[PDB]
A paper describes a structure:
Retromer (VPS26/VPS35/VPS29 subunits) is one important complex that plays a well-established role in protein sorting at endosomes by maintaining dynamic localization of hundreds of transmembrane proteins that traverse the endocytic system. Briefly, VPS35 adopts an elongated α-helical solenoid fold. VPS26 exists as three orthologs in mammals (VPS26A/VPS26B/VPS26C) and adopts a bilobal arrestin-like fold. VPS29 contains a metallophosphoesterase fold that serves as a scaffold for binding the α-helical solenoid of the VPS35 C terminus.
To generate improved reconstructions, we combined images from previously published data with a new third dataset in which specimens were tilted to gain additional views. We obtained an improved heterotrimer reconstruction from 43,808 particles with an average resolution of 4.9 Å. Map sharpening in PHENIX followed by several rounds of refinement and model building (see the Experimental procedures section) further improved the heterotrimer model. This structure demonstrates improved local resolution across the heterotrimer. In the previous version, the N-VPS35/C-VPS26 interface was poorly resolved compared with the VPS35–VPS29 interface. In the new structure, the arrestin “saddle” fold of VPS26 is more clearly resolved. For comparison, the buried surface interface between N-VPS35 and C-VPS26 in the heterotrimer structure is 6178 Å2. We previously proposed that the VPS35 subunit could exhibit flexibility along the length of its α-helical solenoid, as judged by local resolution along the heterotrimer particle. However, the new reconstruction instead suggests that the poor local resolution at the N terminus was instead driven by missing views.
Numbering used by the authors:
A (entry chain D1): 13 to 469, 484 to 678, 695 to 733, 739 to 780
B (entry chain B3): 8 to 306
C (entry chain B4): 2 to 182
The structure:
Amino acid sequence: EKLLDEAIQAVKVQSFQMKRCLDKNKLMDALKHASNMLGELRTSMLSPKSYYELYMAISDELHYLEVYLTDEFAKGRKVADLYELVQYAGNIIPRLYLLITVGVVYVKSFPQSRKDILKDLVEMCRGVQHPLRGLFLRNYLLQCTRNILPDEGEPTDEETTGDISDSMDFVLLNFAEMNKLWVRMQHQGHSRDREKRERERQELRILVGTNLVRLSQLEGVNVERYKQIVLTGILEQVVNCRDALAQEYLMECIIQVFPDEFHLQTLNPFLRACAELHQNVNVKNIIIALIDRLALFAHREDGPGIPAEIKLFDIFSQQVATVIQSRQDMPSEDVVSLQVSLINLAMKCYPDRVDYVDKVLETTVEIFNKLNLEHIATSSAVSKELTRLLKIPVDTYNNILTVLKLKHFHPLFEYFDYESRKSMSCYVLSNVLDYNTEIVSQDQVDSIMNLVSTLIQFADEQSLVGRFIHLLRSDDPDQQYLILNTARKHFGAGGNQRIRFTLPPLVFAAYQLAFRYKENSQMDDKWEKKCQKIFSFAHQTISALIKAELAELPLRLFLQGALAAGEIGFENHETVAYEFMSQAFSLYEDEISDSKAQLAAITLIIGTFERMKCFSEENHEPLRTQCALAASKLLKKPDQGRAVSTCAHLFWRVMECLKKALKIANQCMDPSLQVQLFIEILNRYIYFYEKTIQVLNQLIQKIREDLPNLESSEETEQINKHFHNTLEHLRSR
Amino acid sequence: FGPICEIDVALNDGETRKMAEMKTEDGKVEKHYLFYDGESVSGKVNLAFKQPGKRLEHQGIRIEFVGQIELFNDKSNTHEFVNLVKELALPGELTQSRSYDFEFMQVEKPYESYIGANVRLRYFLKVTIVRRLTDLVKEYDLIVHQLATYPDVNNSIKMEVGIEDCLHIEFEYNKSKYHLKDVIVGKIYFLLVRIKIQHMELQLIKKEITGIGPSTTTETETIAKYEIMDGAPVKGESIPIRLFLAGYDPTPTMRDVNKKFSVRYFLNLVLVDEEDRRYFKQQEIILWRKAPEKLRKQR
Amino acid sequence: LVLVLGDLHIPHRCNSLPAKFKKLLVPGKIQHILCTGNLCTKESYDYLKTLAGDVHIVRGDFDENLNYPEQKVVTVGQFKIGLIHGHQVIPWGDMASLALLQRQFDVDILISGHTHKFEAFEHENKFYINPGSATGAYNALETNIIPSFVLMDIQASTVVTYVYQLIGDDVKVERIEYKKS
């Protein structure tokens, strides 16, 4: 490529010798230096980048020759016949570059000679037939003629000829001779360097793009003229290129430089021209740039918005499909992304209308149902494209109830991979979860279980059933139960692991419901039987824990059921609590091996039962004995002593169990533990004493000898000051 | 002793108009009075006598307008086709610078003063003072043109040429009889391109046919090699041609002057491929000088 | 700054902690966390983890996992603090029994509850806390339940208390002070 280095070398030498004669007012022989100079463009041995750098080097050095020829003519020192004087040389290239030099000045200095010379220089461009020299001189021409084209906002030196019509036909002819030669870029030179030709096509294409930027600068090109001449004239140059990359760089250049409103009404025409494109075209990026800039104008304020005539929805859909219909050998991700944009636009441009996005995703199922594709796994990129597709509808809708209220939302989820299907299902549920969803209608009640039907066949469900009590809290004095009963049935069909997390809240949701009819006790007259249904419905749900082999959870649940029965006042509640009392009694006595849990049961049973002041002593006493029976079934001593002591409150005879409590404490080995239990009998006597009396005095004396006969540790002194402080409250002085 | 008498020819209208000039042998640049057919010549032969005390005896004094062509650099066939003679003095003496008035009424000039290699057409006034042994022959060259106005018809030479299954082009010369300051405007119209063409060049080439009949010495030179094109074109390309022939200094196409030499000009469409062959096509054009005229307006 | 709450029932009786309580509680300001119980799900326990790290939990009547301790004690700086729920109490709410509970453990400070109604008093030179339900979780004995949570500042032999209760739709606060004897 050293040919290039010696090329610009001879360039400066004649560059500075022409300026030598320029300063000497030797115009004729200075152009002679330029004539021996521009004949370096005669070569074709240089790389297009190599030639491009020299061409820019030449474009700025003839610019110095231009500013010389400019100040000559501008102030009146115009050497005549230059339009013809330059036409004596042999080599074609120096002769022409001087011709444009004279030509542009003749346009500015002589307004009347505008249109005519414009119709000569551009045709004189074909005075060459090379692909490469053809490009650069005309991009050079575009630089020289950049702003001298006419317009409507024109200075009124009315000798001028030519208007915006002249400009548009001018540059379209420039657009013609550039696109044609840029395709002749593809098949020139040697055969082994087709990639070299195409990469340099990616380089000098910006030169042609400058012509298209010239188009945007024309303010006189309005919507009417553009669509009828400039667009079609471009589209004529669009359809005749018969080359992929030539078509690729151009089309995106048309959208990116031409403003939005020009592309507003070209939807039918331009995309029919897109249907005219080759199969090697990146039609995606063309429509990507389309909807990019189109949605950019749809969401820019300070204007009418989008005209009411234009229904982008159906027009896009009809022309989009034709783009699919016209194309041939097409990867899956192509149609997915276009449908993504269809979803994208139909939501953004039509937020308040929901049946529109419905149809597009309805077509999406119809597209891929007709598409003979098997069950979509995660491997191919189609998985990530349809994921991006399905992601948009849920994210975009502000109130996610509209996501749930979609009937055709369900078909989409079927075709996904198990890993993908699980991941998206918990996400869409989480969206119903992470945002506070209020009362949910029966229609969406069936939806959520249907969404559950997609997921199950984790604690995520527990979060769902956690707000289920809220999003399916209803102010109806009947229906709420059916909501819970639907949860009872369908969530019970989920399996066995889940119900341990949801029934204990669903049953209390029934308690809420049960106490909701405590509120409705005066409002309703059937609530007593409805509770009986609910307390039995609890028993049904509790029985679901039984088949789930759960033991302790129903215990307290029966206890509130006993509490709920005894507090509401519905008919037969005493036996219902009794029935539950027998249930909790039986479950405790059946299987549990450990002791502490059994301790918690009876202590919570006895605590509620004392508070359960609706069991008459015809029922209280048999249960009082059964609580005494339950305590006796234990293994270790001090635990039983606490239980029987608590049984004394059930007679509120009291001191009967107190005497037994003393007896149970007398067969322990370690003196450390037995002595505070002695105190725990004293204070127990103290409490009932203040509600029988002399037993307190003797027992205080009894612990006095029982205290000091031991070896001590950090626990001994704690009970000594405990005892002394115990005396301080008995010190009621 | 120097010359006995110097012959000096000054025309009575040797100051008018302007000068047009022509290039002579060795590239020398000689200027002689431009005339035209039907124009009279008149002047004074200043016979400046140089040697005082001596005398110039003679057998007459005359001046001859001799329009003659010399062919093949030979003096044995110097042929005068124009010969007008004015007698200035009879046999006598020259003792001083005597001015003799001469005037050849309406000198007929059937051909333009043109100079070739083996062709040399000249007009001159030869003063021949007949001395006893050596007549003082003084020559005063005079350039003359061949005038003609615009032609009635200058038809469009529109022809198809090419090489079979290799090339076929339509070249259109808008005119066929141009004058010396014309412009060749036309078009080259491709109909077939299957060759790795490197360029197209148009050569303005003269054939100087010299001699009479079989003695044909046609020297051929390319004054111009005009460039219009480069590279190998494709189907559907139109090539206007624009060539100013002013920078060529051409001579009118002279059709068999005196049946001893002719001047014809041919355009040669020369086409060269990357393998360096040349394809040529020959087309005659007539040239002719037109007028020294006030340049403006056009019919 | 230490926090006190209890009787949550996050899945059980309500949906979650009331929104205004969950903007007041933000991570960074509180250095220790204390709870009474009835989490009923790792949600509140993990939410307490988000709030701070010095978190200590005792089992309610309705929590499930067995790794949580039934009771816990702490001697932070100067004070002795006890931690229970409150279901292990005769006719829950008895004044004499709770005075006994400190008398057993000889702490300076107790936390209790299980009644879902807020209580707090100082007695026999010792001081007790019943934050109640911080989610307004229903209780059988008392119909209406008000969410309420407690925060406390201990400098030296002196703890400030701040309890926020849910009456109506606003945060109403009552302030109580304690001095270590």
